């Protein structure tokens, strides 16, 4: 404000604010049973196979 009172006038001002990021982490869990895992690569014989 420019104003004529008994008070001395004030100042132009300026503000600078510091902001930054926040890290986060997410899991997930898979089990694959070792009786299952290999027989993707099995011996490949029977019509039951």
């Amino acid at each position: 404000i420019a104003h004529g009172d008994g008070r001395r006038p004030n100042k132009q001002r300026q503000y600078i604010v510091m902001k930054a990021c926040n890290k986060h982490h997410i899991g997930a869990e898979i089990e694959l049973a070792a009786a299952d895992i290999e027989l993707l690569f099995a011996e490949k014989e029977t019509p039951l196979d």
Binding site: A34, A35, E38, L39
Partner: protein
Amino acid sequence: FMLSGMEAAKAPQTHKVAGVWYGSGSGLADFIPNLSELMDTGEFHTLLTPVGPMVQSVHSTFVTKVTSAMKGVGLARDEPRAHVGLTLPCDMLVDLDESCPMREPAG
């Protein structure tokens, strides 16, 4: 349990079966005639060597073949990609981890 001669109420679950696994204990104590004095010198624990779990029984009327396992996870015999786990009598296990839930971290 039978070679010891330990008491009934100390382990009353298998004592019913430990007389139908085998006889009255004379079918086992004939091989070791020192069990009344192996206790005296206190050297029975110096003679055992643990082995672990079984894997395969091959049996006959006289001589039974036993293929045991050490060092780790014994691969099974009936199915491929199968593993033999250790089994137990529940009579003989005594846990230590349990209490009232009331904490100590796991590992």
